[PDB]
Design a protein around this motif. Structure first.
Motif, mmCIF file in Angstrom:
data_model
loop_
_atom_site.group_PDB
_atom_site.id
_atom_site.type_symbol
_atom_site.label_atom_id
_atom_site.label_comp_id
_atom_site.label_asym_id
_atom_site.label_seq_id
_atom_site.Cartn_x
_atom_site.Cartn_y
_atom_site.Cartn_z
ATOM 1 N N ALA A 11 50.278 22.557 14.564
ATOM 2 C CA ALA A 11 50.046 22.769 13.122
ATOM 3 C C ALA A 11 49.547 21.502 12.400
ATOM 4 N N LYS A 12 50.308 20.418 12.421
ATOM 5 C CA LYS A 12 49.896 19.153 11.851
ATOM 6 C C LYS A 12 48.499 18.690 12.197
ATOM 7 N N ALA A 13 48.146 18.680 13.501
ATOM 8 C CA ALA A 13 46.801 18.318 13.991
ATOM 9 C C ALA A 13 45.717 19.246 13.448
ATOM 10 N N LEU A 14 46.057 20.519 13.272
ATOM 11 C CA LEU A 14 45.064 21.513 12.814
ATOM 12 C C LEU A 14 44.983 21.593 11.288
ATOM 13 N N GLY A 15 45.817 20.825 10.580
ATOM 14 C CA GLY A 15 45.817 20.864 9.094
ATOM 15 C C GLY A 15 46.484 22.125 8.578
ATOM 16 N N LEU A 16 47.419 22.647 9.338
ATOM 17 C CA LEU A 16 48.045 23.902 8.967
ATOM 18 C C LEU A 16 49.386 23.566 8.400
ATOM 19 N N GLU A 17 50.056 24.593 7.906
ATOM 20 C CA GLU A 17 51.156 24.370 6.998
ATOM 21 C C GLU A 17 52.164 25.483 7.276
ATOM 22 N N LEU A 18 53.251 25.177 7.957
ATOM 23 C CA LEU A 18 54.148 26.263 8.337
ATOM 24 C C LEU A 18 55.281 26.391 7.366
ATOM 25 N N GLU A 19 55.788 27.601 7.293
ATOM 26 C CA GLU A 19 56.928 27.908 6.535
ATOM 27 C C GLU A 19 58.039 28.096 7.598
ATOM 28 N N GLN A 20 58.808 27.011 7.803
ATOM 29 C CA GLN A 20 59.973 26.969 8.688
ATOM 30 C C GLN A 20 61.069 27.863 8.191
ATOM 31 N N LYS A 21 61.501 28.807 9.005
ATOM 32 C CA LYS A 21 62.731 29.547 8.779
ATOM 33 C C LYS A 21 63.647 29.094 9.914
ATOM 34 N N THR A 22 64.792 28.508 9.590
ATOM 35 C CA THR A 22 65.610 27.781 10.572
ATOM 36 C C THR A 22 66.526 28.677 11.415
ATOM 37 N N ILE A 23 66.454 28.511 12.739
ATOM 38 C CA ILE A 23 67.212 29.381 13.612
ATOM 39 C C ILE A 23 68.097 28.501 14.436
ATOM 40 N N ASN A 24 69.339 28.410 14.020
ATOM 41 C CA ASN A 24 70.166 27.336 14.498
ATOM 42 C C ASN A 24 70.943 27.873 15.658
ATOM 43 N N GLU A 45 68.873 40.904 13.927
ATOM 44 C CA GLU A 45 67.527 40.962 13.330
ATOM 45 C C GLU A 45 66.537 40.238 14.201
ATOM 46 N N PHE A 46 66.936 39.016 14.592
ATOM 47 C CA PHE A 46 66.158 38.118 15.423
ATOM 48 C C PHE A 46 66.037 38.639 16.856
ATOM 49 N N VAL A 47 67.087 39.288 17.345
ATOM 50 C CA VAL A 47 67.080 39.839 18.722
ATOM 51 C C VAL A 47 66.133 40.997 18.844
ATOM 52 N N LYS A 48 65.807 41.590 17.697
ATOM 53 C CA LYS A 48 64.899 42.687 17.633
ATOM 54 C C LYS A 48 63.492 42.100 17.442
ATOM 55 N N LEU A 49 63.466 40.986 16.719
ATOM 56 C CA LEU A 49 62.230 40.212 16.605
ATOM 57 C C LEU A 49 61.790 39.621 17.950
ATOM 58 N N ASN A 50 62.708 38.883 18.573
ATOM 59 C CA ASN A 50 62.439 38.248 19.870
ATOM 60 C C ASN A 50 63.405 38.702 20.955
ATOM 61 N N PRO A 51 63.004 39.707 21.778
ATOM 62 C CA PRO A 51 63.844 40.190 22.906
ATOM 63 C C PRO A 51 64.459 39.071 23.814
ATOM 64 N N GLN A 52 63.680 38.000 24.045
ATOM 65 C CA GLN A 52 64.126 36.862 24.874
ATOM 66 C C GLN A 52 64.997 35.856 24.153
ATOM 67 N N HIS A 53 65.346 36.148 22.884
ATOM 68 C CA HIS A 53 66.098 35.282 21.965
ATOM 69 C C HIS A 53 65.822 33.766 21.978
ATOM 70 N N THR A 54 64.558 33.401 22.004
ATOM 71 C CA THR A 54 64.192 31.986 22.017
ATOM 72 C C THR A 54 63.460 31.567 20.704
ATOM 73 N N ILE A 55 63.201 30.265 20.497
ATOM 74 C CA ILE A 55 62.281 29.893 19.464
ATOM 75 C C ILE A 55 61.315 28.883 20.139
ATOM 76 N N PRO A 56 60.099 28.655 19.572
ATOM 77 C CA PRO A 56 59.746 29.112 18.207
ATOM 78 C C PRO A 56 59.330 30.522 18.219
ATOM 79 N N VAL A 57 59.336 31.155 17.052
ATOM 80 C CA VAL A 57 58.625 32.400 16.944
ATOM 81 C C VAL A 57 57.620 32.334 15.818
#
Lengths: 220, 218
Positions: B22-35, B45-57
């Motif tokens: 992102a930084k190198a490409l001049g992009l701008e992320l909206e971090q949602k923190t997954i602790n 919610e997230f387990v339905k989002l990501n079956p493998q339960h990893t980040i980043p997503v």
């Protein structure tokens, strides 16, 4: 000049590519690199690949290391269509995620099990190796919401996963009542005309080998 | 359209591989923190989002990509101003897809073999079996750096994957300097990016600390 693969049929990433060739109608010249005898540590192959891994592709000058890259490149150059590796970015990202899941989870955990047995003299499968591999099976069963690992269409991501799974399952039991999606998926890939030859026999045979190799490390 | 949404954690090395990207490409992320340490990735919610339960997503306007390397590839492809980060040429592309796969299959994986059992399973050693394993991967990465950057003359996302991993694990399993000059010279190239310390360096350095602090569960 024909494509050359430096290869060993027992090798999972080797079989990933062999499946791909087959799927592409490509005829590979196999040159064996027997890792058991250190063919890969020999100075001429260390020149082709400083990681001294197989497979290695040689396409008339161009040398590509690493199964997933050689598979991408074969489809990109030689595919008559892109089913095996989508050009659409969104579609290609689902393939990519499943290719890296295979590299980083399934094969990495298999290696963490096999390598110490086949090369470091080891005679056990530690319980933590087992859990990592059993967790990798569940991660795969959850990734199979569609018929194939990265969608409703078969991709090089499926060859990559099958080549691994078919090796490790003959060593770390894959319970069928708990993984119906994986088994229904294996069943699909076995229907392929070239499946026994490009993969199923080397997977089966590597599993048996690791087991023989480990009965063997307990003794002398 | 909508902004880019990453479900992330700055301590996580693959997240930072995407941050550098992102930084190198001049992009701008909206971090949602997954602790992870408080189980936020196992939340329904997230387990339905990501079956493998990893980040980043990555949430890109409803396109959901999991897996950092596929993310970094998507973002270069769709939003690059050039193929500088991910060549379009089949051959130079293949060199980069080889470094990326070395990266998940070797560097990251062996760091997870060390780190995970310590941060998640209550363990308090690093067996000489793990050490040797990560050192052999230092060595493979040194063998690979025959040019200035991991995948050749020019920095790619492949250099982002490697450094994000190598910067977390150096502070736990020492990366000895006399043995790996190319790696060190190369870390030195990466630290010469103005966004390096921000998007990567600090979190990698603090992933190291948190492992050593948490190990002290003797």
């Amino acid at each position: 000049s024909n494509l050359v693969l430096y290869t060993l049929h027992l090798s999972p990433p080797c079989r990933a590519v062999e499946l791909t060739a087959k799927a592409l109608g490509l005829e590979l010249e196999q040159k064996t690199i027997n890792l058991l005898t250190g063919d890969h540590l020999k100075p001429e192959f260390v020149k082709l690949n400083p990681q001294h891994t197989i497979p290695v592709l040689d396409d008339n000058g161009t040398i590509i290391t690493e199964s997933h890259a050689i598979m991408i490149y074969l489809v990109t150059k030689y595919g008559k269509d892109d089913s095996l590796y989508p050009k659409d970015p969104v579609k290609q990202a689902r393939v990519n995620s499943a290719l890296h899941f295979e590299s980083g989870v399934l094969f990495a955990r298999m290696r963490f099990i096999f390598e110490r047995i086949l090369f470091f003299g080891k005679s056990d499968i530690p319980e933590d190796r087992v859990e990592y591999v059993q967790k990798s099976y569940e991660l795969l069963e959850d990734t199979l919401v569609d018929d194939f690992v990265a969608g409703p269409t078969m991709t090089i991501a499926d060859f990559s996963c099958i080549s691994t799974i078919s090796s490790i399952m003959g060593v770390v039991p894959l319970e069928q009542s708990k993984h119906p999606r994986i088994y229904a998926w294996i069943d699909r890939l076995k229907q392929l005309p070239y499946y026994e030859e490009a993969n199923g026999g080397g997977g089966t045979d590597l599993g048996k080998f690791v087991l023989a190799k480990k009965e063997e490390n307990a003794k002398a």
